[PDB]
């Protein structure tokens, strides 16, 4: 794998979104990974609908949380996911209103990264594209992140409470990192992004629950 990868520079990544109060980061993470694969497979970048996942993945719990794996499998079994345009985000769970006429991507299932293996995660990001991950994002330091490579001594690898998207990896002033797209809007972090410590004993559980869709 290359020493550095950043799929934002390759047109694989849509603008940062804002999930609002809804605990739907799993849906935004899933959508982000699908968007990357859509761009890779078809050559076009489109905003996909997290609301479609919130409302329709009955295996998950809507604004109460959920797994990306269940999201990918839903898209597969449903034979599609809508564009954001065709199924707009409203930040509250509602009845499923999937519309096949607005279908913008498909999914052939998913693959999982071996638990805790940052090297496998790096190789997957290089080989595949953006990868869905879960992290401990519960700390004060994360909320008020501004710049630099994020590292908090107290981060809890077993407390995977937030889903985000690894869109690349690299190094800043000798400090290795993951490039992470969040879904708390562009006013959070660094225009919606955070660089998170890489190869620092799986900091914040970054490689504990990583997956990506097949397409």
Curated annotation (Swiss-Prot):
Q: Which GO terms describe its molecular function?
A: collagen binding; cysteine-type endopeptidase activity; cysteine-type peptidase activity; fibronectin binding; proteoglycan binding; serine-type endopeptidase activity
Q: How does it sit in the membrane?
A: Peripheral membrane protein
Q: Which residues of the full protein are shown?
A: 115 to 329 of 329
Q: Where in the cell is it found?
A: Lysosome; Secreted; Apical cell membrane
Which cysteine residues pair off into disulfide bonds?
A: 22-63, 56-96, 155-204
Top-level taxon: Eukaryota
- Catalytic machinery residues: 25, 162, 182
Organism of provenance: Homo sapiens
Q: Which UniProt keywords apply?
A: Cell membrane, Disease variant, Disulfide bond, Glycoprotein, Hydrolase, Lysosome, Membrane, Protease, Secreted, Signal, Thiol protease, Zymogen
- Family, per entry: Belongs to the peptidase C1 family.
Does the keyword Signal feature in the UniProt annotation?
Answer: yes
Which disease does the UniProt record connect it to?
Pycnodysostosis: A rare autosomal recessive bone disorder characterized by deformity of the skull, maxilla and phalanges, osteosclerosis, and fragility of bone.
| Listed name of the protein | Cathepsin K
Q: Name one GO cellular component term.
A: lysosomal lumen
- Could you tell me what reaction this enzyme catalyses? Broad proteolytic activity. With small-molecule substrates and inhibitors, the major determinant of specificity is P2, which is preferably Leu, Met > Phe, and not Arg
